[PDB]
A paper describes a structure:
Human noroviruses (huNoVs), members of the Norovirus genus of the Caliciviridae family, are the leading cause of acute gastroenteritis (AGE) and are associated with almost 20% of all AGE cases worldwide. The major capsid protein (VP1) is composed of a shell (S) domain and a protruding (P) domain, and the P domain is further divided into the P1 and P2 subdomains. The P2 subdomain is the main determinant of NoV diversity, antigenicity, and glycan binding patterns. In conclusion, GII.13/21 huNoVs have developed a novel GBS that interacts with glycans via the common β-Gal through a unique glycan binding mode.
To further explore the structural basis of the observed GII.13 huNoV-glycan interaction, we solved the crystal structure of the GII. SC1065/2016 P domain in complex with Lec disaccharide to a 1.6-Å resolution in the P1211 space group. Lec disaccharide was visible in the (2mFo-DFc) omit difference electron density map, and two sugar rings fitted into the map. The Lec-binding sites are located on the top of each P domain. Eight residues from the P2 domain were involved in binding to the β-Gal of Lec via hydrogen bonding and hydrophobic interactions. Specifically, W298 from the B loop, S357 from the N loop, and N395 and T398 from the T loop formed the bottom region of the binding pocket, and N297 from the B loop, T359 and S360 from the N loop, and N397 from the T loop constituted the edge region of the binding pocket. The β-Gal interacts with the side chains of N297, S357, T359, N395, and N397 through hydrogen bonds, while T398, S360, and W298 form hydrophobic interactions with β-Gal to support the binding outcomes. In contrast, the other saccharide of the Lec disaccharide, N-acetyl-β-glucosamine (β-GlcNAc), points away from the surface of the P dimer and as a result, only a hydrophobic interaction was formed with E396. In addition, the GalNAc formed a hydrogen bond with N396, while the GlcNAc of the mucin core 2 trisaccharide pointed away from the surface of the P dimer without directly participating in the interactions. These structural data show that the GII. P dimer interacts with Lec/core 2 glycans mainly by the common terminal β-Gal.
Author numbering:
A (entry chain B), B (entry chain A): 3 to 311
């Protein structure tokens, strides 16, 4: 029986699985009114990807395809007809919520669209177009292979093979950034399907543990932080995918250890469906040294009583 | 002895180690007049990182730090005083060519700077600043902790903590994109230090094998492709770092296999210093199916004669 293991990576060596930026801290908080059902960064401990999860951070919130002129519309001057990583048209009949890597938060995603290369004399960054991809637009239908592009800088050309590089999120007067409200992958008034399940603590006194990053915000949230919290960093997802070690129990007891002091700082429950719970009450950014990392201890059932963190 | 292994990943499941985009193809070519001495994606087979190589794709050609006003006189309206992943000031005395993740190509890197969040009414993408980072500028001195920022869109504010997200490259009338000319990390008229060694084929009939991507080009190279070629994908670098398996000979013989036909398509020599050679003459994008991957076969010496590819 292949042993289950975790990669040995400090917090600064981990990538957010919901946006291509490094993890900054571990963070716990109650679920109060949030449905915790993110679709990127979903993977069982025995290596089964779930939701819209794939292996490349460079594909998370990244899009590519052909631009289609959309005249008669205030917001999206063009659409993007999405293609697979190598030009193949996306099949909406796959049993997934949306193309793998699709943004799994509600609101505005900001990035740069690039298109056919232009001559040097055309101008500086003339093939770079700042665009908003808003999930509240009626044109946000990634499940059927089309999203709406709202150009901000540098008019976008139709009928050109284009790539979208994500930079951050945005919040304008009527579109709040809501990381735990899934977007309508199939368009307005349509409900989401084939979703990775929502997660929540089920043992008394426990809370979810998140890998937390601050995403750049190009509009709004003055004096505030745009947080993106994932259940698993990308490197854990990829490690479980590679190893495919069979799960021997409901929970993998993991201990957070400091390697040069040799002491365990706290412990947590890594559930077989791919998320972590800790014994704590309240919103709390975890105070841990920069060289610490989780270590797989043993297989326990879901009724294991953690030491309070 | 811990066995040496490669990760089981297809071409579309690999990331360029020199720019945060996926690998598109394998590509071999003679060195003719290029010095092949890239500094990102450099790692020995037993897990020794070299050059400017670190583990995160989100750190390659990404920068962060404090903006500094620069009036007088050239290209760069502001400088970026570089800081570590968590705000620590960069130490120029470290035995490395430049901060880890620093671009290792000559020319113009394009991306978006983000700064202190602004209110919603400030405007769309107002906290998004399109900038050129040119290595031919006298302000390109990342080895001493500072680079020059040429603003294209959205004036950059001084004295703000800022993050630069890379998007692509650019080529203007006098700054060609040269992926095999290392930039002057320490400024104009200064030579580079602490470099990972240059690589070249040393056996008759052999050429380097590259992992190739097309990087977005926001100015110039009309009708052309801005290729970035790396010696190792990021996933191999991180795998070797995790495993740290001892190298038993000068060369790891590796075979490219198709897993659903069972056939071996070609073989190659993976040298212990972390680069691949193949038996081929001429520039050639390798014609291989999308499901193929490299498999470690055996340890051989540097004089192993490969089957012609
Ligand atoms: C900031 C604001 O309130 N803008 C209003 C527009 O709202 C945008 O609508 C598009 C869809 O067309 C997206 O949903 C985007 O996220 C929204 O911010 C609205 O379309 C127009 C209607 O006249 O009014 C603007 O004020
Ligand atoms: C396109 C062009 O010819 N530009 C010239 C400027 O060259 C730039 O110089 C900066 C450093 O100052 C960078 O090296 C950049 O990559 C260059 O393109 C040059 O500075 C000015 C002199 O006035 O002339 C421009 O024509």
């Amino acid at each position: 029986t292949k042993p289950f293991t975790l990669p040995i990576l400090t917090i600064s060596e981990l990538t957010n699985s919901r946006f291509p930026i490094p993890i900054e801290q571990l963070y716990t908080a109650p679920n109060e009114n949030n449905v915790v059902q993110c679709q990127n960064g979903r993977c069982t401990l025995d290596g089964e990807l779930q939701g819209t999860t794939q292996l490349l951070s460079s594909a998370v919130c990244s899009y590519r395809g052909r631009t289609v002129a959309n005249s008669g519309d205030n917001w999206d001057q063009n659409l993007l007809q999405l293609t697979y990583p190598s030009g193949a048209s996306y099949d909406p009949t796959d049993e997934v919520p949306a193309p793998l890597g699709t943004q799994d938060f509600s609101g505005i995603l900001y990035g740069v669209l690039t298109q056919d290369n232009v001559s040097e004399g055309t101008g500086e960054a003339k093939n770079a177009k700042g665009v908003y991809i808003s999930t509240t637009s009626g044109k946000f239908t990634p499940k059927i292979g089309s999203i709406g592009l709202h150009s901000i800088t540098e008019n976008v050309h139709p009928n050109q093979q284009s790539r979208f590089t994500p930079v951050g999120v945005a919040q304008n007067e009527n579109t709040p950034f809501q990381q735990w409200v899934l977007p309508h992958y199939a368009g307005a008034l349509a409900l989401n399907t084939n979703l990775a399940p929502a997660v929540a603590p089920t043992f008394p006194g426990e809370e979810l543990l998140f890998f937390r990053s601050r995403v750049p915000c190009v509009q709004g949230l003055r004096g505030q932080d745009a947080f993106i919290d994932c259940l698993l960093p990308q490197e854990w997802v990829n490690h479980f995918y590679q190893e495919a070690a069979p799960s021997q129990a409901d929970v993998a007891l993991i201990r957070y250890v400091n390697p040069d002091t040799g002491r365990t700082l706290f412990e947590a429950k890594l559930h077989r469906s791919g998320f972590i719970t800790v014994s704590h009450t309240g919103a709390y950014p975890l105070v841990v040294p920069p060289n610490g990392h989780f270590r797989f201890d043993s297989w326990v059932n879901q009724f294991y009583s953690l030491a309070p963190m």
